[PDB]
């Protein structure tokens, strides 16, 4: 069993409840969303950073275990054109669970973002046998949010 650790603090939300079909309908994969309360986003697995959006509000990571994840702050955040976000990590950087990747200005985001719901998804669906979603409140870099069986 592989455990995916909270990339940010806040409360776990049903992915299907996200206001974005691309996510709500699992086109890219399945996972969970998080209504944020913190100030940053960390690596949820040990592995390699893949890509970071040029607006720095999203990023992908490859775990050593072989799981591919996509973490996207809020809904339609691109429109914000990078406001309120700072990139910490670098593209193919080698990271560990809890390593900071992006830092955000929530109060600002809460004001200007259409949504602050943050999808955490396994873009790797075919390669995995089973995905178990957890519930409740999570602490950045501490709590499991998803458990998989590969």
Binding site as annotated, residues for Zn(2+): 57, 72
Interface map 121-150 toward its own copies (x if CB under 8 A): --x--x------------------------
CB atoms within 10 A of CB 71: 23
Binder to its own copies among 11, 17, 64, 79 (CB under 8 A)? 79
Binder to its own copies among 39, 53, 87, 143 (CB under 8 A)? 53
Rule CB under 8 A: is residue 82 a binding residue for its own copies?
no
DSSP string of 103-119, one letter each residue: EE-HHHHHHH-SB--EE
Q: Per the structure block, which two tokens stand in for 99? A: 């390593």
Alpha-carbon span 145 to 71, nearest angstrom: 13
**Which residue, 38 or 74, is less far from its own copies as judged by CB?**
74
CB of 72 to its own copies, least distance (A): 7
**Which residue, 30 or 134, is less far from its own copies as judged by CB?**
30
Going by C-beta distance under 8 Å and a sequence separation of 6 or more, which residues neighbour residue 1?
A: 147, 148, 149
Give the three-class secondary structure for 43: coil
For residue 72, indicate whether it is catalytic.
yes
Alpha-carbon span 98 to 77, nearest angstrom: 23
- Chain residues in the site for its own copies (CB under 8 A): 20-22, 25-28, 50-51, 53-54, 58, 60, 70, 72, 76, 78-79, 123, 126
As annotated, the active-site residues are 72
């Amino acid at each position: 069993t592989i455990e995916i650790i909270a990339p940010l603090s806040g409360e776990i939300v049903n992915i299907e409840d996200v206001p974005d079909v691309v996510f709500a309908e699992k086109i890219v994969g399945d996972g969970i969303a998080i209504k944020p309360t913190g100030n940053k986003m960390v690596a949820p697995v040990d592995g390699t950073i893949g890509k970071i959006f040029e607006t720095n509000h999203a990023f992908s990571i490859e775990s050593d275990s072989g799981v591919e994840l996509f973490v996207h702050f809020g809904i339609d955040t691109v429109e914000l054109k990078g406001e309120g976000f700072k990139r910490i990590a670098e593209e193919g950087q080698r990271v560990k669970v809890g390593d900071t990747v992006i830092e955000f200005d929530l109060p600002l985001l809460e004001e200007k973002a259409k949504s602050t719901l943050t999808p955490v998804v396994i873009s790797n669906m075919d390669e995995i046998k089973e995905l178990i979603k957890l519930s409740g409140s999570v602490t950045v870099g501490e709590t499991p949010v998803i458990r998989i069986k590969k």
